[PDB]
Amino acid sequence: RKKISIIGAGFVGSTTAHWLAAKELGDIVLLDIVEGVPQGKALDLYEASPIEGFDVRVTGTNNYADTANSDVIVVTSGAEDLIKVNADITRACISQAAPLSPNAVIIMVNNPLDAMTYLAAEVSGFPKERVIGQAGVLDAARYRTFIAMEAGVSVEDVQAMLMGGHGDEMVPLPRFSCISGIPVSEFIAPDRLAQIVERTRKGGGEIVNLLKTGSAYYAPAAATAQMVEAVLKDKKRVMPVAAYLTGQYGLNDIYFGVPVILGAGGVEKILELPLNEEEMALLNASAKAVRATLDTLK
Amino acid sequence: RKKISIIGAGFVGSTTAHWLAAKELGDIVLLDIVEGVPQGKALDLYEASPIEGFDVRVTGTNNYADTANSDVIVVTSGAREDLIKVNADITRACISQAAPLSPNAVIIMVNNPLDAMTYLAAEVSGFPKERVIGQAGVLDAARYRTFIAMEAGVSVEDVQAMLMGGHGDEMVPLPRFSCISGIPVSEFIAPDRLAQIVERTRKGGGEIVNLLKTGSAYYAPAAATAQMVEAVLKDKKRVMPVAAYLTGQYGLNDIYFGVPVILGAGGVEKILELPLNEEEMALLNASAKAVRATLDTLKS
Amino acid sequence: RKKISIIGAGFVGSTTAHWLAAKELGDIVLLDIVEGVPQGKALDLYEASPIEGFDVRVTGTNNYADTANSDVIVVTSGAEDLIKVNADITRACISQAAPLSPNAVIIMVNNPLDAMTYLAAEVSGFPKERVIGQAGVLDAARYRTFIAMEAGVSVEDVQAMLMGGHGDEMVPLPRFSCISGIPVSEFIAPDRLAQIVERTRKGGGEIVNLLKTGSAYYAPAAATAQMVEAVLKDKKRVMPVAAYLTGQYGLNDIYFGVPVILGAGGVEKILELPLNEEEMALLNASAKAVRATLDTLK
Amino acid sequence: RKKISIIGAGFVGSTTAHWLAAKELGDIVLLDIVEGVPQGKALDLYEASPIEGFDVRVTGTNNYADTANSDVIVVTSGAREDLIKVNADITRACISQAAPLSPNAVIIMVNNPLDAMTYLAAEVSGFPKERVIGQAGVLDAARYRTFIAMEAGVSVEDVQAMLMGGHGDEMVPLPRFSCISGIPVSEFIAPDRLAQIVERTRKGGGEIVNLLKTGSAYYAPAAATAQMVEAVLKDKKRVMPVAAYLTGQYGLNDIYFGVPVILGAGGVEKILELPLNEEEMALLNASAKAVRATLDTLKS
Numbered sequence A, C: 001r002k003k004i005s006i007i008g009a010g011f012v013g014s015t016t017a018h019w020l021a022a023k024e025l026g027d028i029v030l031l032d033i034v035e036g037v038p039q040g041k042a043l044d045l046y047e048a049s050p051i052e053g054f055d056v057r058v059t060g061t062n063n064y065a066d067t068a069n070s071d072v073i074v075v076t077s078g079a080e081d082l083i084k085v086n087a088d089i090t091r092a093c094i095s096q097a098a099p100l101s102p103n104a105v106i107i108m109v110n111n112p113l114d115a116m117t118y119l120a121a122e123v124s125g126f127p128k129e130r131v132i133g134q135a136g137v138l139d140a141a142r143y144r145t146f147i148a149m150e151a152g153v154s155v156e157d158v159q160a161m162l163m164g165g166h167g168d169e170m171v172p173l174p175r176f177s178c179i180s181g182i183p184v185s186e187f188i189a190p191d192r193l194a195q196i197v198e199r200t201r202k203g204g205g206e207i208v209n210l211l212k213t214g215s216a217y218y219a220p221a222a223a224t225a226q227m228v229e230a231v232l233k234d235k236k237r238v239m240p241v242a243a244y245l246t247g248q249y250g251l252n253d254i255y256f257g258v259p260v261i262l263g264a265g266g267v268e269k270i271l272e273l274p275l276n277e278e279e280m281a282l283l284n285a286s287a288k289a290v291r292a293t294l295d296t297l298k
Numbered sequence B, D: 001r002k003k004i005s006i007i008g009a010g011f012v013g014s015t016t017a018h019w020l021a022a023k024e025l026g027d028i029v030l031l032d033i034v035e036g037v038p039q040g041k042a043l044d045l046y047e048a049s050p051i052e053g054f055d056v057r058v059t060g061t062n063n064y065a066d067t068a069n070s071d072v073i074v075v076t077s078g079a080r081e082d083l084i085k086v087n088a089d090i091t092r093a094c095i096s097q098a099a100p101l102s103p104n105a106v107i108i109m110v111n112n113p114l115d116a117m118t119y120l121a122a123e124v125s126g127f128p129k130e131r132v133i134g135q136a137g138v139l140d141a142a143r144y145r146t147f148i149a150m151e152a153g154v155s156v157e158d159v160q161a162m163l164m165g166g167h168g169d170e171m172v173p174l175p176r177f178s179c180i181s182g183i184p185v186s187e188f189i190a191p192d193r194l195a196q197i198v199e200r201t202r203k204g205g206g207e208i209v210n211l212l213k214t215g216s217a218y219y220a221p222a223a224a225t226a227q228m229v230e231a232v233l234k235d236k237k238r239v240m241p242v243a244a245y246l247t248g249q250y251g252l253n254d255i256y257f258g259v260p261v262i263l264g265a266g267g268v269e270k271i272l273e274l275p276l277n278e279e280e281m282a283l284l285n286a287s288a289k290a291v292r293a294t295l296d297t298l299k300s
């Protein structure tokens, strides 16, 4: 069976483990620095197996040795000061996990996402195609949900692409969204679409403001799990993910949210969209922001 | 539980029943005029339930009384003028007996000639046009999406497409209205290669017939039909191409034609009117002419 | 579409909502007394829909009016003093929800389970068959997981029945458990089986001891969701649930965990197992304990 | 991805391919000696992928070279001594060509006579006995579980059962080893009614043949076969009745017989030896005599 190790058994990590286990995608190892937590969450999930009908081992641990030979490593352990804290956490997680699973595809979820993925690439020394970050799938999912709700159509028929990072760094691309092949712009008028784009930008904060003490985890976990599935089943999904750029969109030496074909080899293709001047202005501004964070990290 | 009656226990009908059952979408009644066939296929499907894990009733019958009060009626009992005549007789017989027993059902036609038979079903049942539709576009778009996905090297889950008209020469391809995760298909496939894929889609049904030699496709056709049934039963509001009755859309009146619609609990909840360019209109008008001809023969 | 209202948007309630939504079982309404919480959890789940592919409305609210006309009402809002606190919470939830959904099946999850279900029956005034509690499905699930692990077989092939309540009130029935129709006792020897029975009794506490601050929710939610599904799809599942007894097992005027056939009408049959003297001694002791809790409630 | 080769693109084979594909269990290769049939069925199934949402390759072929390096080989190409002879020839041809190309595969036989053909497949392939099994018990138990569930008025998901031997007269019913959510089936069904259900199970295959008149069951048989394939590919360790090679179990030696096993990645990982009472042994011995006779004819 395939093996997936999830580093950080918090809300996102445990929820991700649940979806992966339910789909029988492989044995799951939940690791955390806090003793008892991962073991308890793993056992709780495991005990749901006779009810849900899945046969995969779900174990919790505090020892990185148990993550050896994983096919995929998901990192959901994150917390100017934010970069510092998360940078140390990421270096610690990757430096211990990477060596034990040399052929794994690493999927970063920790924030600041683009920068942390870049760091994981540096620390692991893995081929760039095998180190990616989850960000765009979640943001596109929120956009798709809003579009489906406004248009009054099935979420199964709404598809969309976007780039960059989260919040102000997000590069919306409404032009590159369709409903069963039909432009979204044919269903939703300009002003309403602009409102939906703005809601997408602030999507994470909207959940935080409602929860008061926590952040979103259901959609973030679903997005992460869909990426893991794409790798394990070599599905060649077309999705926006944080990938290492070598000239695409005029960008070099940087991890940025871009459309890719995701499969068993990780990023199997970075798609180059024919962005117009307005869209490129947005991308360039985002890249500048992402670049700043990266320079601070260095 | 919801109730679905499938008229015609052949390959498409029985395969459609299997998917609906596996998804526990509702109790299923398979009907056929041949004694023993539906009963045998229903029992076979039912005996698979402990393995597949579904709890829905699956029964075969030769009596229309068993289809009473169905939420959806699927017609897969079909067999140029001779073809139209034979199928017209089969369709009239099927609908004239089933419709009265399930007045609140949505009728989904599969019999060929599809558009014409859906029109006939509308007349015979007297049902509101929104509740009488035909499956054709979903299958055609499925073939197109399959070919595009394989050529572009991407998941079939990320390719979506719209098209209109009918099957074969009546098909109105609309590559401009197809995307891969929101990105235009034209950005992935070269024009010459795309034209080839469009042609393969037009001849998609025949391609299978020539391979089987003594049969026709049923897996994809059944999947398409089942997806439409699910759209209605679960009120999903799917955006898909289906044969619907037009009263002005695309310049067509009093005719069933494959068009983009929002499909849900009330059947067709909206007929979308896409802004077609001159070339696409030329294709559509030529197609409507062919559909009209079939419709006129039927009326004759 | 069917409508399911979940009262209490905590760990168990939100997790239950996730499974129900993923399976497209019906529109879900998450209600809670705390503002923002249910709305945030509902929106987070809803935004996962384009990824998971389900079309059902998931909304959060603080207003009981939004729960009107529900087909199923799940109560997961619970916290000698334990009976007091939970009793008031239960009376408040049911007295407000029951009147708005007169034809609903109520599934209680709050502890003390048997007593709270009895209370919900009193407050709602609903036919007894339509007011049940979730307890046995979770306990049997833990047992099945342990048996599957020890025997080295698929959890999909292990089935088991048990009765009573949780912990010391649980009435284990290893004799009534099989692996693909074969007695569990043929796979697992007496001493090891006794160990597994004891682990099942302490199953909830085992998770609490590992989590340190929280309790189990994945398996509890799965158990609850399986019961909701049984009702919505009229599956006639045979499972142990807290039901009102009118003479079965020699018990009257009490809610107790017993084997039932669960469907759209709620409890459609209470099965009467041919328990031997040893098993009946266990049941009688449990009933005495459950009876004591009930008397205190009164 | 895992790779599954299905030899014989008839009803059972094609239906089995559909389930495996829908569950994305691995790439599927459908092989048949008739040109065009497998290619047509494979393309039809493949074109359903955008609708059902699966990303696995489904191809049809007439060349065994395309089945190379398969994880599992399913044989559904079969057609008293005449029956044995014809099928023996088909099985030998199928196995002698496929086995060498997929040395690490688990072979799952479906051809009738099941036990005898599985024995033949073992000989021809030379594979370790644990990796050569036959599907028969899962289907028989499925029919039994279906009848029990309907009679008891409970979900098919909660009825489990074990049985041994072969099909029809060779079937060894074991009601004592069947439960409903852990509760003995005997507590739900009266003795006389249970005996009737056991009889219906024995004649289960024939019941379908008589209804169809010109065909045989394939939905339940395919479901049973697919569940076994899944058990191997996902190393689930399912406890199920399958035709396995005995070397002493139940007093039987050098013979394939339906017995309880734990099925996983290595094929048969354990043959369970149930403590049968005198009456059950009488049934088993009579069955083994019938299976032995078929085996001896084959060896002749």
Ligand SMILES: NC(=O)c1ccc[n+]([C@@H]2O[C@H](COP(=O)([O-])OP(=O)(O)OC[C@H]3O[C@@H](n4cnc5c(N)ncnc54)[C@H](O)[C@@H]3O)[C@@H](O)[C@H]2O)c1
Residues within 6 Å of the ligand: A007, A008, A009, A010, A011, A012, A013, A031, A032, A033, A034, A037, A076, A077, A078, A079, A089, A092, A093, A109, A110, A111, A113, A134, A135, A138, A166, A204, A215, A216, A217, A220
């Ligand atoms: N849409 C997105 O891009 C998105 C959405 C949500 C959360 N996130 C990010 O994902 C991460 C996890 O979010 P969460 O809400 O699940 O957090 P959380 O606080 O619930 O869980 C993080 C877990 O990491 C563990 N941890 C810390 N240091 C560790 C180390 N060195 N090794 C192993 N485990 C360690 C903690 O003990 C904790 O259980 C955060 O960095 C957050 O910002 C991103």
Ligand SMILES: NC(=O)c1ccc[n+]([C@@H]2O[C@H](COP(=O)([O-])OP(=O)(O)OC[C@H]3O[C@@H](n4cnc5c(N)ncnc54)[C@H](O)[C@@H]3O)[C@@H](O)[C@H]2O)c1
Residues within 6 Å of the ligand: B007, B008, B009, B010, B011, B012, B013, B031, B032, B033, B034, B037, B076, B077, B078, B079, B090, B093, B094, B110, B111, B112, B114, B135, B136, B139, B167, B205, B216, B217, B218, B221
């Ligand atoms: N993509 C498409 O548009 C598409 C795809 C497949 C099939 N079709 C059409 O669907 C129909 C069925 O195709 P099939 O391959 O399943 O055929 P089939 O011959 O396998 O089955 C048709 C079944 O209808 C039954 N039947 C005939 N007259 C009947 C009546 N009056 N009442 C009840 N049952 C009756 C037959 O006995 C037979 O079992 C055909 O008309 C075919 O052209 C269209």
Ligand SMILES: NC(=O)c1ccc[n+]([C@@H]2O[C@H](COP(=O)([O-])OP(=O)(O)OC[C@H]3O[C@@H](n4cnc5c(N)ncnc54)[C@H](O)[C@@H]3O)[C@@H](O)[C@H]2O)c1
Residues within 6 Å of the ligand: C007, C008, C009, C010, C011, C012, C013, C031, C032, C033, C034, C037, C076, C077, C078, C079, C089, C092, C093, C109, C110, C111, C113, C134, C135, C138, C166, C204, C215, C216, C217, C220
């Ligand atoms: N296996 C079992 O039988 C089992 C397992 C776990 C939990 N439980 C029980 O289930 C209940 C929920 O457990 P949890 O861990 O999810 O708890 P929790 O504390 O996470 O969530 C309970 C939620 O109820 C809400 N609440 C309180 N009073 C309310 C009222 N009057 N109306 C509406 N909402 C109200 C809270 O604000 C909170 O969000 C508890 O009573 C617990 O003991 C039983």
Ligand SMILES: NC(=O)c1ccc[n+]([C@@H]2O[C@H](COP(=O)([O-])OP(=O)(O)OC[C@H]3O[C@@H](n4cnc5c(N)ncnc54)[C@H](O)[C@@H]3O)[C@@H](O)[C@H]2O)c1
Residues within 6 Å of the ligand: D007, D008, D009, D010, D011, D012, D013, D031, D032, D033, D034, D037, D076, D077, D078, D079, D090, D093, D094, D110, D111, D112, D114, D135, D136, D139, D167, D205, D216, D217, D218, D221
């Ligand atoms: N429950 C059971 O035990 C059970 C259930 C169903 C079928 N079966 C058996 O399974 C076999 C298949 O049944 P079916 O209904 O699918 O039959 P079928 O006649 O529909 O299909 C068999 C296919 O095998 C092909 N074939 C023949 N010889 C071949 C060879 N040498 N190589 C490759 N392909 C070859 C044919 O051309 C045909 O397409 C039969 O032997 C039948 O008795 C057993």
Ligand SMILES: [Cl-]
Residues within 6 Å of the ligand: A112, A113, A114, A115, A116, A165, A290, A293, A294
């Ligand atoms: Cl960043």
Ligand SMILES: [Cl-]
Residues within 6 Å of the ligand: C112, C113, C114, C115, C116, C165, C290, C293, C294
């Ligand atoms: Cl109690």
Ligand code: NA
Residues within 6 Å of the ligand: A015, A018, C015, C018
């Ligand atoms: Na969850």
Ligand code: NA
Residues within 6 Å of the ligand: B015, B018, D015, D018
């Ligand atoms: Na099928």
